[PDB]
Amino acid sequence: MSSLLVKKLVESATTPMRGSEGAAGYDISSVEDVVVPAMGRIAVSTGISIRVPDGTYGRIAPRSGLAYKYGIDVLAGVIDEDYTGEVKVILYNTTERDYIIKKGDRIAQLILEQIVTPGVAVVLD
Amino acid sequence: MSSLLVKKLVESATTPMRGSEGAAGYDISSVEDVVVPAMGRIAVSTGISIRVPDGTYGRIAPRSGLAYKYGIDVLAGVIDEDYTGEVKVILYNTTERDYIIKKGDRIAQLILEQIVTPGVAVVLD
Amino acid sequence: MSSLLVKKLVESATTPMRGSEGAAGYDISSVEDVVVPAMGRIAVSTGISIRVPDGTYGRIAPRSGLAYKYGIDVLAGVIDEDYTGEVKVILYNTTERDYIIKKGDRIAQLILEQIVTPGVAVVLD
Ligand SMILES: O=c1ccn([C@H]2C[C@H](O)[C@@H](COP(=O)(O)OP(=O)(O)O)O2)c(=O)[nH]1
Ligand SMILES: O=c1ccn([C@H]2C[C@H](O)[C@@H](COP(=O)(O)OP(=O)(O)O)O2)c(=O)[nH]1
Ligand SMILES: O=c1ccn([C@H]2C[C@H](O)[C@@H](COP(=O)(O)OP(=O)(O)O)O2)c(=O)[nH]1
Ligand SMILES: [Mg+2]
C-alpha cells in the first residue's frame, strides 16, 4: 500500500514512529554511538531504508528538543521517492561544545511532505 | 473551520498574515525585544498559539530578508497539528555581529505545508 | 498549464530538471563563477525566473552531495507563487575552507511543495 514502507538493515534499527496523534513526523533514531563535533557535522546512520508514499518526498527535519538545547541542526535531508539506499541523517553542531549520540537516540524526524512533480515549461521560446 | 486558528496570549502579539496574493507564508512577529547573539541562537516568543489545518503541519521558515542581510537562519521550526502551547521561533545568527529584534518585527513566516500521515509498513518480516 | 513555468534571463542559465523518476526536486544550477566564503554566505544567481504551480510554493532545498562533502547549507529558500523576479540561491558555508562554484554547477534543487493557504481565524474574540 502507499504508507511508509520501512526496511531495517540492522536489528539495532528502530521502526520510525510518530509521537502523537497530531505529530507531523515519524521519529528517526541513531543506530550507532557517535559524536557530532563542535561547529562540525557528521553523518549518523539510521540503519533503515524507506519508500515514501507516492507524490510525496521525505524530509529529515530537526527536533525541537536538540535544536533548542544543543543547537543541533539538520543539513541536506531530502530523501527522494526513488531512494533505495540507507537513510543517513546529516547533523550540524552549532555549538562550541560536542554533542553525544547513542544507539537508539531519536536524532531527527521524517516528514512525508506532499509535492507536485510536473514537467517543465520553458518560456521565451 | 479548517483555516489557521490563531490564539493571542499577549495583546502585544500580532495576527499572522500573508504579505501577498501568492505569498507562501503568514508573517510571524516577535513579541519581545531580544538579541540573537553572534554565532548564537535564541528562542524568540511569538505570544500566540495556533492549530494548523488538518492533514498539514506548520513550518517556521526563514525570511528572505533577514537571511540575506543578517545571515539569520531558523532552527527546528516543526509545529505539529497537535501543538497547544505557544509558538517559539528559534533563530540562529550566522554572523560575527549581533542582531537586534524588537516587539513587532516580523522574524519568520509560517507555512502550512501539506503532509501525509499514514501508518508504517515494516518489511523483512 | 500548471507545471513549472521557467524563464531564462541569460543564455548561460540552465532549465531546472529532475535527476530521476522519483527525484523530489528539479536541479538548480549556478550561472556565475562564485566563491562561498568559509563560515560565510553568498547569493548565487540562477539567471532564471519561475512560477510554481498553483497551491504550492517552491523551496530551494540543499543537495545531499554538497551538504555532506563541503558542509554547504541553504539559507532562506522560500519562493512565493507570486515571485516574478530572478531566483537567487543563498548558500551558507559551514566549513573553515572556501567553496568554489562555477557556471553550470548544480548548487541546489527546487521542490514544488504543496501548501494550503487559508484565511486566519482569530480566537479569544
Ligand atoms: O540527508 C540526506 C539527504 C539525502 N539522502 C539520500 C536521499 C536521496 O535519494 C539521495 C540523493 O543523493 P543524490 O541526490 O543522488 O546526490 P545529489 O543530491 O548531489 O544529486 O541521498 C540521505 O540519505 N540523507
Ligand atoms: O521551532 C519550534 C519547533 C517546535 N515547536 C513546538 C511545536 C511542537 O508541537 C513542539 C514539539 O516539541 P517536541 O516534539 O514534543 O520535543 P521533540 O521535538 O524533542 O520530540 O514544539 C516550537 O514551538 N518551535
Ligand atoms: O532564497 C531565496 C528566498 C526567497 N527568494 C525570493 C522569493 C520571494 O518571492 C521573494 C521574497 O522576498 P520578500 O519576502 O518580499 O522579503 P521578506 O522575506 O523579508 O518578506 O524573494 C529568493 O529569490 N531566494
Ligand atoms: Mg544552518
XYZ file of C-alpha atoms and ligand atoms in Angstrom:
448
model
C 0.000 0.000 0.000
C 1.111 3.659 -0.038
C 2.163 4.168 3.575
C 5.709 4.387 4.863
C 7.448 1.185 3.778
C 10.383 0.669 6.150
C 13.208 -1.876 5.796
C 15.594 -2.437 8.732
C 19.153 -3.252 7.661
C 20.409 -3.915 11.192
C 18.443 -5.354 14.116
C 19.650 -2.382 16.163
C 17.486 -0.168 13.907
C 14.181 1.272 15.192
C 10.937 1.494 13.208
C 10.104 5.152 12.552
C 7.063 6.161 14.566
C 5.015 9.300 15.222
C 4.990 10.532 18.804
C 1.424 11.797 18.816
C -1.952 11.985 17.098
C -1.126 15.334 15.505
C 2.629 14.791 15.242
C 3.935 15.753 11.815
C 6.867 13.391 11.739
C 7.986 9.844 12.421
C 10.931 9.760 14.841
C 14.232 8.671 13.308
C 16.747 7.117 15.704
C 20.516 6.633 15.655
C 21.873 3.115 15.194
C 25.411 3.913 16.313
C 27.083 5.780 19.180
C 28.581 8.820 17.513
C 29.841 12.296 18.309
C 28.746 15.312 16.272
C 31.751 17.751 16.638
C 31.552 21.338 17.809
C 30.958 23.620 14.813
C 31.119 20.395 12.840
C 28.873 17.950 11.052
C 28.503 14.201 10.990
C 26.552 11.573 9.116
C 24.602 9.445 11.566
C 23.374 6.074 10.200
C 19.711 5.135 10.741
C 20.171 1.552 9.628
C 16.939 1.639 7.650
C 15.780 2.200 4.073
C 12.353 3.619 3.237
C 9.963 4.292 0.366
C 7.930 7.423 0.934
C 4.344 7.207 -0.358
C 3.720 8.305 -3.928
C 3.520 12.008 -4.824
C 5.329 12.999 -1.632
C 9.001 13.026 -0.610
C 10.562 12.581 2.817
C 12.222 15.476 4.602
C 14.552 14.821 7.524
C 13.512 17.722 9.805
C 15.222 18.778 13.072
C 13.795 18.002 16.536
C 12.581 20.921 18.663
C 14.466 19.373 21.558
C 18.023 19.053 20.263
C 17.683 22.310 18.343
C 16.879 24.414 21.383
C 19.005 22.570 23.963
C 22.136 21.688 21.946
C 21.961 23.853 18.851
C 21.759 20.762 16.668
C 20.614 21.453 13.084
C 19.870 19.125 10.122
C 21.783 19.574 6.805
C 20.637 18.177 3.409
C 17.712 15.976 4.444
C 15.911 15.466 1.101
C 15.069 11.808 0.536
C 13.677 11.103 -2.931
C 10.840 8.641 -3.545
C 13.278 6.640 -5.659
C 15.923 6.273 -2.900
C 16.660 2.610 -2.309
C 19.750 3.063 -0.119
C 20.022 3.607 3.654
C 18.787 6.809 5.279
C 21.701 8.895 6.529
C 20.950 11.785 8.893
C 23.419 14.653 8.498
C 23.571 16.795 11.638
C 25.447 20.041 12.132
C 26.577 21.154 15.600
C 26.016 24.903 16.049
C 27.743 24.752 19.441
C 31.291 25.204 20.692
C 30.732 22.007 22.676
C 30.460 18.460 21.283
C 27.231 16.500 21.285
C 26.901 12.829 22.177
C 24.606 10.412 20.357
C 23.893 6.830 21.414
C 22.314 3.899 19.541
C 18.589 4.404 19.961
C 18.526 8.186 20.395
C 15.860 9.856 18.299
C 18.120 12.185 16.285
C 15.657 13.668 13.795
C 12.202 13.097 12.342
C 10.875 12.122 8.924
C 8.041 14.106 7.368
C 6.254 12.820 4.295
C 5.682 16.177 2.627
C 3.340 16.314 -0.356
C 4.932 17.696 -3.501
C 3.870 18.147 -7.111
C 6.194 16.776 -9.731
C 5.050 18.253 -13.096
C 7.046 18.839 -16.246
C 8.998 21.965 -17.083
C 7.576 24.645 -19.386
C 10.261 26.907 -20.836
C 9.127 30.367 -21.911
C 10.962 32.855 -24.140
C 10.821 30.312 -26.991
C -13.384 25.626 10.088
C -10.012 24.329 8.836
C -8.086 27.567 8.356
C -5.350 28.894 10.599
C -6.845 29.150 14.085
C -4.770 31.717 15.987
C -4.915 32.479 19.726
C -3.086 35.554 21.077
C -1.673 35.064 24.576
C -0.493 38.663 24.954
C -2.083 41.788 23.473
C 1.358 42.684 22.119
C 1.044 39.655 19.796
C 0.303 40.132 16.071
C -2.089 38.014 13.996
C -0.108 36.027 11.421
C -0.818 37.353 7.947
C 0.330 36.703 4.378
C 2.090 39.585 2.663
C 0.743 38.926 -0.811
C -1.692 37.061 -3.041
C 0.891 34.413 -3.906
C 2.824 34.587 -0.635
C 3.522 31.129 0.753
C 3.647 32.089 4.392
C 1.937 34.077 7.115
C 4.345 36.531 8.761
C 5.280 35.696 12.348
C 6.334 38.638 14.520
C 8.371 38.992 17.708
C 6.554 39.920 20.913
C 9.667 40.879 22.861
C 12.798 42.967 22.277
C 15.566 40.403 22.128
C 19.103 39.956 20.866
C 20.111 36.902 18.840
C 23.898 36.535 19.636
C 26.677 36.310 17.086
C 27.232 32.661 16.133
C 24.497 32.006 18.664
C 20.842 31.097 18.844
C 17.852 32.379 20.746
C 14.230 31.475 21.283
C 12.031 34.409 20.343
C 8.452 34.290 21.725
C 5.562 34.918 19.306
C 2.966 35.210 22.038
C 0.485 33.148 20.049
C -0.719 29.550 19.817
C -2.072 28.054 16.593
C -3.806 24.999 15.157
C -2.676 24.270 11.628
C -5.436 22.935 9.353
C -5.906 19.179 9.220
C -3.547 16.991 7.170
C -0.890 19.706 7.109
C 1.722 20.865 9.634
C 3.230 24.305 10.149
C 6.840 25.012 9.259
C 8.562 28.105 10.625
C 10.576 29.112 7.521
C 13.236 31.867 7.326
C 12.607 35.286 5.728
C 14.485 36.132 2.523
C 15.264 39.498 4.070
C 16.981 38.621 7.343
C 18.674 35.633 5.726
C 20.442 37.649 3.056
C 21.082 40.843 5.047
C 21.941 39.473 8.516
C 22.654 35.798 7.979
C 19.733 34.878 10.212
C 18.631 31.227 9.916
C 15.732 29.273 11.505
C 16.469 26.139 13.626
C 13.887 23.420 14.487
C 10.667 25.008 13.229
C 8.329 21.979 13.059
C 4.981 22.731 14.684
C 2.731 19.680 14.974
C -1.027 19.835 14.389
C -1.451 18.740 17.999
C 0.642 21.595 19.485
C -1.418 23.518 22.009
C 1.418 25.573 23.518
C 2.912 28.900 22.376
C 4.860 29.176 19.128
C 8.547 29.754 19.817
C 10.758 30.858 16.919
C 14.331 29.596 17.265
C 16.761 31.748 15.279
C 20.449 31.140 14.707
C 22.830 34.028 13.979
C 25.321 33.052 11.255
C 27.142 36.363 11.738
C 30.040 37.573 13.858
C 27.833 40.545 14.733
C 24.728 40.520 16.958
C 21.238 41.043 15.612
C 18.564 43.185 17.237
C 14.890 42.234 17.372
C 12.078 44.475 18.606
C 8.471 43.703 19.604
C 6.568 43.690 16.335
C 9.397 42.717 13.980
C 8.404 40.004 11.542
C 11.053 37.420 12.483
C 9.958 34.420 10.418
C 6.982 33.072 8.494
C 4.588 30.168 8.977
C 3.850 27.834 6.080
C 1.019 25.337 6.296
C 2.699 22.534 4.373
C 0.576 19.572 3.313
C 1.832 16.240 4.601
C 0.601 12.657 4.516
C 0.441 10.855 7.813
C -0.032 7.122 7.005
C 0.898 4.098 9.064
C 4.221 2.301 8.985
C 4.709 -0.898 6.976
C 7.719 -2.908 8.127
C 9.261 -5.231 5.549
C 11.703 -8.098 6.132
C 9.058 -9.835 8.278
C -0.731 24.914 -17.787
C 0.165 24.420 -14.102
C 3.641 22.913 -14.365
C 6.904 24.679 -13.647
C 6.990 27.739 -15.901
C 10.653 28.698 -16.314
C 12.032 31.890 -17.893
C 15.775 32.139 -18.638
C 17.173 35.654 -18.232
C 20.647 34.769 -19.511
C 21.554 32.164 -22.133
C 24.072 30.783 -19.636
C 21.091 29.703 -17.487
C 20.056 26.023 -17.309
C 16.476 24.720 -17.351
C 15.657 23.164 -13.973
C 15.324 19.411 -14.331
C 14.709 16.396 -12.093
C 17.517 13.859 -11.937
C 15.327 10.787 -11.636
C 11.867 9.247 -11.815
C 11.367 9.556 -8.062
C 13.528 12.649 -7.576
C 11.785 15.236 -5.421
C 13.457 18.279 -6.880
C 14.484 19.989 -10.092
C 18.215 20.771 -10.114
C 19.078 24.465 -9.898
C 22.430 25.480 -11.387
C 24.768 28.437 -10.902
C 25.071 30.972 -13.715
C 28.233 32.620 -12.414
C 31.612 31.505 -11.057
C 31.467 32.460 -7.406
C 33.087 31.658 -4.085
C 31.003 30.942 -0.988
C 33.345 32.040 1.914
C 34.329 29.915 4.880
C 31.784 30.386 7.679
C 30.181 32.816 5.262
C 27.230 33.097 2.931
C 26.725 34.223 -0.630
C 23.887 34.836 -3.036
C 24.398 32.767 -6.164
C 22.367 33.883 -9.224
C 20.391 31.235 -11.142
C 19.618 33.515 -14.055
C 16.042 32.268 -14.222
C 12.590 33.287 -13.001
C 9.846 30.751 -12.290
C 6.157 30.423 -11.460
C 5.483 27.472 -9.201
C 2.191 25.678 -9.924
C -0.885 26.889 -8.075
C -1.480 25.917 -4.435
C 2.183 25.032 -3.948
C 5.311 27.114 -3.306
C 8.913 26.433 -4.279
C 11.513 25.563 -1.671
C 15.204 25.812 -2.512
C 16.465 22.680 -0.696
C 20.126 21.656 -0.193
C 21.832 18.891 -2.215
C 22.864 15.715 -0.381
C 26.198 15.979 -2.155
C 27.452 19.442 -1.227
C 25.953 19.123 2.245
C 27.901 16.013 3.170
C 31.128 16.743 1.267
C 31.524 20.517 1.766
C 29.163 21.394 4.588
C 27.174 23.631 2.263
C 23.732 24.616 3.610
C 20.845 26.631 2.077
C 19.544 29.785 3.873
C 16.122 31.419 3.227
C 14.922 29.483 0.181
C 11.176 30.286 0.184
C 9.988 31.326 -3.269
C 6.396 32.570 -3.312
C 3.970 31.747 -6.127
C 3.782 35.477 -6.811
C 7.566 35.946 -7.263
C 8.273 37.473 -10.651
C 11.952 38.298 -10.076
C 15.056 36.117 -10.540
C 15.706 33.112 -8.311
C 18.647 33.761 -6.002
C 20.155 30.796 -4.147
C 21.596 31.787 -0.768
C 24.232 29.304 0.399
C 25.999 29.210 3.740
C 29.450 27.626 4.099
C 29.659 25.595 7.325
C 33.356 24.949 6.675
C 36.606 26.654 7.619
C 37.584 26.258 3.964
C 36.130 28.152 0.982
C 33.958 26.504 -1.630
C 34.215 27.080 -5.370
C 31.211 27.333 -7.679
C 31.356 27.501 -11.474
C 28.737 28.495 -14.072
C 26.714 25.347 -14.628
C 27.231 23.678 -11.246
C 24.020 22.337 -9.769
C 24.052 24.307 -6.498
C 20.657 23.410 -5.037
C 17.305 21.934 -6.014
C 13.775 23.296 -6.306
C 10.891 21.406 -4.726
C 7.314 22.345 -5.516
C 5.867 21.674 -2.076
C 2.091 21.638 -1.702
C 0.772 24.119 0.837
C -2.650 25.268 1.988
C -3.262 28.978 2.001
C -6.489 29.553 4.019
C -7.601 32.621 5.917
C -6.814 33.397 9.531
C -9.331 32.718 12.308
C -8.599 34.696 15.467
C -9.943 33.233 18.703
C -10.337 34.961 22.077
C -12.768 37.430 20.461
O 20.276 13.916 4.388
C 20.135 13.134 3.457
C 19.807 13.627 2.164
C 19.652 12.721 1.153
N 19.810 11.344 1.373
C 19.625 10.396 0.236
C 18.194 10.525 -0.347
C 18.371 10.665 -1.863
O 17.663 9.641 -2.539
C 19.891 10.565 -2.109
C 20.317 11.682 -3.036
O 21.741 11.702 -3.256
P 21.893 12.497 -4.646
O 20.735 13.417 -4.881
O 21.913 11.356 -5.784
O 23.271 13.313 -4.715
P 22.882 14.863 -5.099
O 21.985 15.446 -4.056
O 24.224 15.757 -5.185
O 22.111 14.914 -6.517
O 20.551 10.718 -0.824
C 20.131 10.895 2.626
O 20.276 9.719 2.844
N 20.289 11.782 3.651
O 10.784 25.856 16.406
C 9.895 25.266 17.005
C 9.730 23.865 16.824
C 8.722 23.244 17.506
N 7.870 23.958 18.364
C 6.782 23.234 19.083
C 5.821 22.561 18.069
C 5.665 21.110 18.540
O 4.300 20.811 18.775
C 6.501 21.007 19.833
C 7.363 19.765 19.769
O 8.231 19.638 20.911
P 8.569 18.066 20.950
O 8.445 17.445 19.593
O 7.469 17.423 21.938
O 10.027 17.787 21.555
P 10.818 16.845 20.465
O 10.926 17.550 19.152
O 12.304 16.519 21.002
O 10.016 15.462 20.233
O 7.348 22.186 19.899
C 8.053 25.305 18.526
O 7.340 25.943 19.257
N 9.053 25.946 17.853
O 16.392 32.136 -1.093
C 15.541 32.855 -1.599
C 14.367 33.185 -0.865
C 13.438 33.985 -1.468
N 13.627 34.473 -2.771
C 12.580 35.340 -3.385
C 11.227 34.585 -3.455
C 10.183 35.540 -2.865
O 9.152 35.786 -3.805
C 10.957 36.829 -2.519
C 10.584 37.271 -1.121
O 11.323 38.431 -0.694
P 10.400 39.058 0.465
O 9.536 38.014 1.101
O 9.471 40.145 -0.280
O 11.274 39.808 1.579
P 10.823 39.184 3.031
O 11.086 37.713 3.067
O 11.665 39.890 4.214
O 9.245 39.422 3.279
O 12.375 36.513 -2.568
C 14.767 34.146 -3.453
O 14.957 34.552 -4.572
N 15.708 33.346 -2.872
Mg 22.469 26.300 9.484
